[PDB]
Design a protein around this ligand. Structure first.
Ligand code: ANP
Ligand code: MN
Ligand code: MN
Lengths: 198, 729, 297
């Protein structure tokens, strides 16, 4: 019957990740309201994977059935339920040692073409050593489309590793690397021993 | 027209006090009542028998040798004075707050001078000032005033314009907080009720019923003669603030104004069915209205039919979005004078009956018809999100389309005419539109039973307008370029963060102030009604003067609460100005707490009001005299925010950083990072940061001292954050 | 019937909307949870007879460490703004509240002692138009982040097979998530189903007054005898139909007005699974059965 596959792992930051939104910060990152820990929103992961998969495929039926659709006539439930990637406990303890802040302020400027004057800017970024526990649920609505969809998920994740997550990652930011801790079918009889990401 | 004569006679019954204080012309040494008869007899329209006898014979000694027609309404005025009221010629009007909360905060001596603020400075009303008042009364009565069934409403406002700061009592033994307008209005309110009550019993001869043995004067106070009626609108917060769309910001003021005029319309419907003037309307504030009605069977039948009818209309137009609950309790004369000590109990029981009405809001048929829906909407309005009502193009419900149409007219015009044809629906198959003076005059000429309301207007010539005190402050309407974008123009700044600020004020323990603040000896219907009017006139009228020159739009003031949207710093600055002015107005004795929010343009309107309402709730925790600024962590006192956060900490930082070539914004951010953590090392890093910050040496020691002590570092953080927002290119 | 307590501890922020995406509510009525269970049952190819005919659930209610919060009874209190602003009363203090014995200070303390989460508003963008020569659409999603020891709970009445089916459905609902943005990371939770000990004591008591625990509504016949001297709160249960099968385009359900949890009635009424669809391909069920917790006033 219906199956749900729980992909859980780590999003290791490879370069300072800034997904824009405690006090006054110049371009602050998005944080958990309670713990005040920087987070990677699931809508940001979902949007970036959808954007990269849309470019790879070419909305397409493969993207619509994977990230959801609401168009007239063809309303497709989103199979990918990408939860918010919260700052891991392991990286919290690892950053507590070295007394390293979870986020760092990156200082830049913009040298004007007309006047050759540098106008400074600051964007807060999650520090490189950070790791976020990502929790994705894939709803197996079709037992025949699961292998093709998980191929697409691997392609979108591979593109995301070669790209940046939220922020001005064209200028360096946002680079990430996924690690899969386990892929276990929490609900249903479907098996995911053969299934894998990356 | 004996009812009309009594209404004119009770309102002008103590007019002789003003003339006697002036002692200008023909001072025949007589009683203020005799002076009032002499003054009013100078004008032919007011020379009616009922009015003159009421003015001249409203006391015991006058009525003992009255020799009247035994049915004249001077007896009714005499009872109305005794209920309302129950020497120094030149005495000021003592502020009502001299008595408010006197058990806790002591007794004050604040008095008014000839909106106005009490000063507490010993002063007297010069008899030449009283002479000028008498001259102006003569001009108004002779030319701009007339006696007629539809012209008393203008007379009641005329008394409001002049006598609102004249003391009603000048006996030095008893304090004088009741103004002449308040005592005359309460006298007319009670006299109207007593006249109806005596008519219901069909008592032909008034004197033995009321005054003759003097023992039935006490007995009449024991009779259940009046009704304390409270009608309270529900769902106002969800109606006005829970809206969406880009037009929500522009239409926010119109939604709140619509509920103000609807509540006024509801009251004027209740009073028109009872043939009573606005004098019986004790108060009308935030969705609330207290009235004093006769205990006649006719009045109870009117109330029952009015309550059932307004339920039918509110369901017809708004279903469950808006509703009105009406509760009434029979009260005696001794209830209003607080002779037995049951005055506060009367108000508590009326509100208790109101809360019981609010619980069981709907009946069997109304609930079933709510769940008897034939067709799903499959289309909704952008703002009201209502699908049951017919939605036209632009995806707007009929009500909100009218609300938007009321906008771009509320700013320009000052007359709200309730008429058969209009923009937004109103009860009794009428509609509300905002028109100019010419447009309103057209509308009232076309079709009768049409009401016209004037907003914050000084008294004018004879007309059927009703004066509505409404806070319509809107800085955008001053400049035509900013008038196009009402509140979103405050986002436009040359320097500073563009974010808007939302201020939600609310007086602390106002209900406890009315019930317990007034001591037993000073509690009465007249003393309470004065307190309601001073508080109402502060919010409705004085708020506009307080926020003058600031980029602030007043969504609502109304009695107890407040809602303003404007520039984030202007809202904070005028919150402190308003807090200081509120302390002067109330002379202490009353504190209000406020939440202040920092929300950008295009921020959800519902979230702007809800999150600031949460902040006000945080400021309502504890001793309640606090302001919750931005985050829930900055719940400061009013003195603490004004003095410690801003003047003591933020101003030194701004001046120091301006003196340098660059306005900080890099030392400030680094200061905040080192202030966010509790590490011992971050204190040392802060010391190094201040040393290299290249500002004055005594300031670095001050900043280091501030960061050391808790409840003083949070003030420093708020000072830095305010400064950072002040400088954002 | 048997009463099992289901405790929902939420991993991520949840978006419970009243009428807008920007709204961030801390709870969902029984109609919202029941529709989640029906959606889960139809996905797992389960039968709907047990949910529709025998299951009596209650509103998801706040719970924090060493306390379980029940809705404020709409009883007459024989400082009155403390009870007006009060929303949830702990179970250990619930029997007291009905009898009285609660001052304005105590009610104010109770409201502040609710350590259920913290609401917020995340702002996101829609770069769909950006590719097509347009501009990003910044939209706000209001979410609620529960505290580490906090969450929502609800009690379930049913037979052995009805409860057993709900154990399966709640296990599958852990990964579907409850809320409004569950496909965008908002609503994941883990639920434990345990026999309630303290709640069975509270449900065993029999007072003169009856207190609603779920968003309920009496049928026409039952509304005749139950509305007398009732103190309630009609809530407009609205929304859009969430289904790929109901229609080609998303349409709103018929407006349904149901009594809020905590409404006190002197006559108990069994609710109904009302149908709020309009000529759709399937019948949309809005749960309005009544979970009654009697009390002594
Ligand atoms: N025209 C208005 N514009 C804005 N705010 C208003 C207006 N009238 C009243 N208010 C405020 O909103 C409140 C009324 O909102 P409402 O939804 O009736 O809540 P309530 O006062 O708790 N009454 P109820 O819902 O019956 O329990 C008033 O007490 C004021 O604070
Ligand atoms: Mn108040
Ligand atoms: Mn208020």
């Amino acid at each position: 019957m219906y199956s749900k596959i729980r992909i859980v792992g780590k999003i290791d930051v490879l370069t300072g990740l800034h997904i824009g939104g405690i006090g006054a910060i110049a371009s602050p990152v998005v944080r958990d309201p309670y713990s005040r820990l920087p987070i990677i929103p699931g809508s940001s992961i979902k949007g970036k994977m959808r954007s990269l998969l849309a470019k790879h495929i070419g909305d397409a039926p493969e993207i619509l059935r994977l990230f959801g659709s609401s168009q007239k006539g063809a309303i497709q439930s989103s199979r990918l339920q990408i939860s918010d990637a919260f700052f891991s406990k392991a990286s919290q303890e690892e950053f507590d040692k070295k007394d390293l802040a979870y986020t760092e302020t990156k200082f830049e400027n913009t040298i004007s073409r007309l006047t050759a004057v540098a106008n400074p800017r600051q964007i807060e970024r999650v520090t490189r050593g950070a790791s976020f526990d990502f929790h994705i649920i894939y709803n197996v609505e079709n037992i025949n489309e699961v292998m093709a969809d998980f191929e697409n998920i691997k392609t979108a994740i591979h593109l995301l590793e070669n790209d940046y997550l939220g922020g001005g990652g064209t200028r360096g930011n946002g680079r990430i690397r996924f690690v899969i801790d386990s892929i276990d079918t929490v609900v249903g009889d479907f098996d995911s021993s053969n299934l894998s990401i990356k | 027209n004996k009812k009309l004569e009594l209404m004119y006679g009770s309102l002008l019954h103590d007019i002789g006090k003003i003339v006697y204080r002036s002692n200008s012309v023909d001072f025949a040494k007589g009683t203020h009542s005799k002076i009032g008869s002499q003054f009013l007899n100078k004008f032919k329209p007011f020379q009616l028998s009922g009015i003159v006898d009421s003015v001249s014979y409203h006391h015991y000694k006058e009525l003992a040798s009255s020799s009247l027609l035994d049915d004249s309404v001077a007896y009714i005025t005499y009872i109305a004075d005794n209920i309302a009221s129950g020497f120094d010629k030149r005495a000021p009007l003592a502020s009502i707050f001299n008595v408010v909360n006197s058990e806790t905060k002591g007794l004050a001596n604040y008095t008014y001078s000839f909106y106005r603020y009490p000063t507490d400075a010993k002063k007297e009303y010069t008899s030449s000032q009283y002479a000028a008042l008498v001259n102006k009364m003569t001009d108004d009565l002779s030319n701009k005033l007339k006696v007629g069934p539809d012209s008393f409403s203008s007379l009641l406002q005329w008394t409001e314009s002049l006598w609102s700061y004249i003391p009603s009592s000048t006996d030095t033994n008893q304090v004088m907080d009741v103004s002449l307008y308040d005592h005359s209005k309460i006298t007319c309110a009670i006299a109207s009720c007593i006249y109806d009550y005596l008519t219901e019993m069909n008592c032909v001869n008034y004197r033995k019923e009321l005054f003759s043995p003097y023992e039935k004067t006490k007995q009449f106070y024991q009779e259940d003669v009046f009704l304390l009626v409270s009608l309270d609108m529900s769902g106002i917060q969800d109606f006005i603030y829970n809206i969406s769309g880009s037009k929500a910001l522009k239409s926010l003021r119109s939604r709140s104004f619509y509920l103000e005029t609807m509540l006024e319309s509801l009251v004027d419907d209740l009073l028109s069915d009872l043939e009573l003037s606005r004098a019986n309307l004790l108060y009308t504030g935030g969705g609330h209205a207290y009235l004093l009605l006769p205990n006649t069977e006719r009045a109870r039948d009117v109330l029952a039919s009015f309550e059932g009818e307004m339920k039918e209309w509110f369901i017809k137009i708004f279903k469950t979005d808006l509703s009105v609950a009406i509760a009434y309790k029979a009260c005696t004369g001794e209830d209003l004078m607080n002779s037995n000590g049951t005055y506060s109990d009367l108000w508590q029981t009326v509100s208790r009956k109101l809360s019981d009405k609010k619980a069981h809001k709907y009946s069997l048929n109304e609930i079933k018809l709510f769940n008897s829906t034939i067709h799903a909407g499959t289309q909704e309005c952008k703002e009201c999100l209502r699908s049951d009502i017919d939605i036209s193009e632009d995806s707007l419900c009929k009500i909100c389309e009218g609300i938007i149409a009321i906008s771009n007219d509320l700013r320009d015009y000052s007359f709200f005419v309730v008429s058969p044809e209009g923009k937004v629906p109103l009860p009794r198959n009428r509609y509300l539109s905002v028109e100019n003076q010419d447009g309103a005059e057209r509308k009232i000429k076309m079709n009768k039973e049409t009401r016209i309301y004037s907003k914050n207007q000084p008294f004018v010539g004879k007309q059927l307008v009703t004066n509505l005190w409404m806070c319509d402050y809107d800085f955008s309407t001053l400049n035509p370029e900013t008038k196009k974008q009402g509140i979103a123009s405050y986002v436009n700044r040359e320097v500073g963060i563009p974010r808007l600020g939302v201020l939600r004020a609310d007086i602390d323990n106002l209900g406890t102030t009315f019930i317990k603040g007034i001591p037993e000896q000073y509690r009465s219907i007249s003393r309470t009604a004065t307190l309601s009017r001073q508080l109402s006139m502060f919010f409705k009228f004085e708020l506009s003067n307080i926020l003058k020159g600031a980029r602030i739009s007043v969504i609502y003031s109304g009695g107890d609460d407040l809602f303003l949207i404007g520039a984030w710093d202007d809202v904070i600055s005028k919150a402190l100005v308003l807090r200081k002015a509120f302390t002067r107005f109330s002379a202490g004795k009353l504190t209000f707490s406020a939440g202040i929010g920092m929300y950008p343009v295009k921020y959800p309107i519902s979230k702007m009001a809800s999150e600031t309402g949460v902040l006000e709730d945080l400021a309502k925790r504890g001793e309640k005299n606090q302001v919750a600024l931005w985050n829930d962590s900055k719940v400061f006192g009013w003195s603490q925010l004004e003095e410690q956060i801003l003047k003591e900490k933020m101003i030194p930082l701004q001046e120091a950083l301006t003196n340098s070539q660059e306005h900080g914004k890099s030392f400030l951010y680094k200061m905040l990072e080192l202030l966010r953590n509790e590490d011992q090392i971050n204190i040392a890093r802060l010391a190094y940061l201040l040393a290299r910050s290249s500002l004055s040496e005594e300031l670095t020691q001050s900043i280091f001292a501030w960061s050391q002590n808790k409840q003083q570092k949070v003030e420093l953080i708020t000072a830095i954050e305010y400064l950072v927002y002040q400088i954002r290119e | 019937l048997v009463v099992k307590l289901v405790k929902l501890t939420f991993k991520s922020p949840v978006h419970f909307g009243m009428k807008r995406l920007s709204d961030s509510n801390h709870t969902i009525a029984a109609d919202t949870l029941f529709s989640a269970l029906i959606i889960e049952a139809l996905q797992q190819q389960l039968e709907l007879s047990h949910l529709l005919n025998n299951l009596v659930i209650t509103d998801l209610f706040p719970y924090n460490k060493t306390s379980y919060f029940l809705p404020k009874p709409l009883i007459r209190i024989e400082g009155y703004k403390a009870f007006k602003k009060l929303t949830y009363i702990p179970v250990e203090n619930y029997s007291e509240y009905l009898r009285g014995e609660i001052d304005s200070l105590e009610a104010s303390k109770i409201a502040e002692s609710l350590n259920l989460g913290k609401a917020s508003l995340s702002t996101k963008v829609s770069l769909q138009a950006v590719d097509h020569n347009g501009e990003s659409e910044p939209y706000s999603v209001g979410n609620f982040t529960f505290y580490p020891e906090s969450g929502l709970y609800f009690l379930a009445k049913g037979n052995a097979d009805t409860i057993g089916q709900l154990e399966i459905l709640m296990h599958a609902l852990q990964y579907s998530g409850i809320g409004g943005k569950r496909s965008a990371g908002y609503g994941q939770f883990r639920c434990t189903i345990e026999d309630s000990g303290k709640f069975d004591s509270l449900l065993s008591q029999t007072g003169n007054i009856a207190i609603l625990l779920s968003s309920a509504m009496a049928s026409d016949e039952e509304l005749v005898d139950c509305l007398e001297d009732a103190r309630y709160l009609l809530k407009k249960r609205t929304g859009f139909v969430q289904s790929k099968t109901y229609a080609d385009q998303l349409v709103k359900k018929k407006d349904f007005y149901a009594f809020s949890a905590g409404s006190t009635f002197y006559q108990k009424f069994n609710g109904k699974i009302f149908d709020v669809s309009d000529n759709g391909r399937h019948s949309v069920y809005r749960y309005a059965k009544a979970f009654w917790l009697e009390g002594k006033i």
